[PDB]
Structure 1
Amino acid sequence: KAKEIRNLTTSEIEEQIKSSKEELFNLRFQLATGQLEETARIRTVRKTIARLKTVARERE
């Protein structure tokens, strides 16, 4: 239900960098050491990346 591709294509590639590298990567470290609660936050960021890539390939 929550779509995050209302923006243009210029700021779009900036979101795939911020969502994956600074957000999805940090949550995997805190899970390994045993410091992260709210484990459902991982599946949310995984879909935010996929929704961004679907619209990018769709615009062609």
Structure 2
Amino acid sequence: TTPGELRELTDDELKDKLRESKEELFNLRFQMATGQLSNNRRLRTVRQEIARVYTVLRERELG
């Protein structure tokens, strides 16, 4: 999800999306540890989604 429509959500759904992406990252980490998921790029993508949401929140807070 690009920052474009990421800037359309309000603060509450932005926090919710951050939460859900964090749980997704947790599940992916456990799957990698047990070694069953193939797509290694999922971890990178989810980490960057978290970073993007944090950036948008900080931009809004700073103005």
**TM-score grouping bracket, smaller chain normalisation:** 0.7 to 0.9
Q: Which runs of 5+ in 2 are unaligned?
A: none
SS at 2:12 equivalent: coil
**Percent identity between the two aligned chains:** 49
**Aligned counterpart, 2:12:** 10
**Aligned counterpart, 2:58:** 57
Is 1:39 the equivalent of 2:40? Answer: yes
Count of residue correspondences: 59
TM-score (norm 1): 0.86
Match of 1:20, as an amino acid? K
CA RMSD for the aligned pairs?
Answer: 1.5
Q: More helix per residue: 1 or 2?
A: 2
Q: Which runs of 5+ in 1 are unaligned?
A: none
SS at 1:35 equivalent: coil
Q: Which runs of 4+ in 1 moved over 3 A?
A: none
